[PDB]
UniProtKB/Swiss-Prot annotation:
Keyword Cytoplasm attached: no
Included stretch of the parent chain: 1 to 145 of 238
Function field: Energy-transfer acceptor. Its role is to transduce the blue chemiluminescence of the protein aequorin into green fluorescent light by energy transfer. Fluoresces in vivo upon receiving energy from the Ca(2+)-activated photoprotein aequorin.
Post-translational modification: Contains a chromophore consisting of modified amino acid residues. Maturation of the chromophore requires nothing other than molecular oxygen.
Protein name: Green fluorescent protein
Documented applications: Green fluorescent protein has been engineered to produce a vast number of variously colored mutants, fusion proteins, and biosensors. Further generation of mutants led to more stable proteins (at 37 degrees Celsius for example) with brighter fluorescence and longer fluorescence lifetimes.
Result after altering V225L: In EYFP; leads to yellow fluorescence, folds faster and more efficiently at 37 degrees Celsius and has superior solubility and brightness
Outcome of substituting K236R: In Topaz; shifts the major emission and exitation peak up to 20 nm
Family: Belongs to the GFP family.
Keyword Nucleus in record: no
Superkingdom of the source species: Eukaryota
């Protein structure tokens, strides 16, 4: 009609910029603006925008480039996090796979993995690290059988060779055999190819030898030889998979498909002759017969993405358009990433500036960080290992305890959002993520295409905010609300008036 709904989550910075977006539409169009709060994280704005203003959703909100990448869109193949499992003399891994659905939604596959050597001898038990994988799925146009051509590059990261590894120094032939059952539908897959572990490359073709595969091929990818991962030179003592060779290892997985069935898989990976063989039993239970898996509603290809500002922005732009029909406008100008802050007296005293400069100082206490930040694998833990932070202690303070401790110098470093209003009232300086651990979180306005169709002027109106809010500005405005207790709606107005952007 004549009404547009602007959403915000229950977060000070979001409330300010969403008030700004609403004021701009009111100042530069004749539309009615409905300002709608959502409770949750930035995924609730996304479900609200998919509903739309017509259905007690929203039409517009401010999203962060990195947020659209990591959740909402998601890495299709994230890092497979590996940890030692003393009790099985092996390793454990947990990770999520994201399968695109033909209707635009995403189908999550939670993988829980365990590996145990088949032989009795010593094997490598690694420190925590991860595997980075990119799979490309293709078709052989001449192949009549239900099949899948697969290319995989796998590298270990997150941190002179076992006898087992000596068996991988060239190209190794691979045989994969799977016997399967899903809700009673029995099937078999056979695959052959080769693996080149020095390059972390797998090349394989899989065929269903019992007819039409009853599940989509992308759900079998993780099931159908992590011993071909490329472990860099400085990490070769963390490669359990090759060190268990030639006797090999048993791999077991539970794969739960969100709101659908689960896969139970047991595999033996070992040398036979000079072939690396992966023999799998898979059982699938409790799948909905009209669901994504048994209904064959998943897209065949994984996507590829980029973690630099422009590539991330362009990626969320393309995919949000292709899936769900949603338009990204221009960035407001600030990057609200997660960061570390110290007292500004401490920063000039020791001439700090960057995370590396901080890491060089081990006589510091980082117990002022939130538990979530200390517990997330890509929170402090990953950061600690990329920068080798040598912090004295690491207690986990939440509420506002963190801020009051750095105030009294019980703690010297805290975690914070880069635009956190409280950084100014406590006189702390943020530090530069020089090694770019975190993805960029540039805020930009987001709008449904059909609202844009109905009201084309909204594109120009919302782009009048492009690069109109620097990091320092968003900090000062967050401060006025969280520090001084001003109404966020009045804070947004005053800023826009002072810029001549509204009446």
């Amino acid at each position: 009609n004549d009404t547009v709904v602007v959403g915000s989550i229950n977060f000070t910075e979001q409330i300010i910029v969403a008030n700004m977006v609403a004021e701009m539409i009111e100042a530069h169009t004749d539309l009615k603006v409905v300002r709608k709060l959502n409770l949750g994280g930035t995924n609730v704005n996304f479900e609200a925008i998919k509903r739309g203003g017509a259905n007690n959703g929203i039409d517009i909100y401010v999203e962060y480039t990195g947020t659209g990448l990591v959740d909402i869109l998601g890495f299709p193949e994230p890092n497979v996090y590996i940890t030692a499992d003393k009790q099985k003399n092996g390793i454990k891994a947990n990770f999520k796979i994201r399968h695109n659905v033909e209707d635009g939604s995403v189908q999550l596959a939670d993988h829980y993995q365990q590996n145990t050597p088949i032989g009795d001898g010593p094997v490598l038990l690694p420190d925590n690290h991860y595997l980075s994988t990119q799979s490309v799925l293709s078709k052989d146009p001449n192949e009549k059988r239900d099949h899948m051509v697969l290319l995989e590059f796998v590298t270990a990261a997150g941190i002179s060779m076992s006898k087992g590894e000596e068996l991988f120094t060239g190209v190794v032939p691979i045989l994969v055999e799977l016997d399967g059952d899903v809700n009673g539908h029995k099937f078999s897959v056979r695959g052959e190819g080769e693996g080149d572990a020095t390059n972390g490359k797998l090349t394989l073709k899989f065929i269903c030898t019992t007819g039409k595969l009853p599940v989509p091929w992308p759900t079998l990818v993780t099931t159908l030889v992590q011993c071909f991962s490329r472990y860099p030179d400085h990490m070769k003592q963390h490669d359990f998979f090759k060190s268990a060779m030639p006797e090999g290892y048993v791999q077991e997985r539970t794969i739960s498909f969100k709101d659908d069935g689960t896969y139970k898989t047991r595999a033996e990976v070992k040398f036979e002759g000079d072939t690396l063989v992966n023999r799998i039993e898979l059982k699938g239970i409790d799948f909905k017969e009209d669901g994504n898996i048994l209904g064959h509603k998943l897209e065949y290809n994984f996507p590829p993405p980029s973690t630099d500002p422009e590539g991330a922005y362009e990626t969320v732009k393309k995919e949000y358009k292709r899936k769900w029909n949603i338009v990204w406008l221009k960035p407001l100008g600030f990057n609200n990433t997660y960061t570390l802050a110290v007292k500004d007296e401490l920063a000039k005293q020791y001439n700090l500036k960057t995370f590396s400069d901080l890491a060089k100082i081990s006589d510091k206490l980082i117990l002022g960080a939130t538990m979530f930040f200390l517990e997330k694998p890509d929170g402090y833990p990953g950061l600690q290992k990329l920068y080798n932070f040598k912090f004295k202690h690491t207690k986990s303070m939440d509420m506002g305890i963190r801020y009051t401790a750095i105030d009294n110098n019980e703690v010297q470093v805290i975690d914070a959002f880069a635009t956190d209003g409280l950084l100014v009232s406590h006189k702390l300086k943020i530090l530069e993520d020089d090694k770019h651990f975190f993805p960029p979180y540039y805020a930009a306005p987001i709008i449904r295409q059909d609202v844009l169709d109905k009201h084309p002027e909204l594109k120009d109106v919302l782009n009048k905010l492009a690069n109109q809010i620097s990091d320092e500005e968003m900090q000062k405005l967050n401060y006025k609300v969280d520090g001084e207790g001003q109404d966020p709606a009045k804070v947004a107005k005053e800023f826009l008036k002072e810029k001549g952007l509204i009446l």
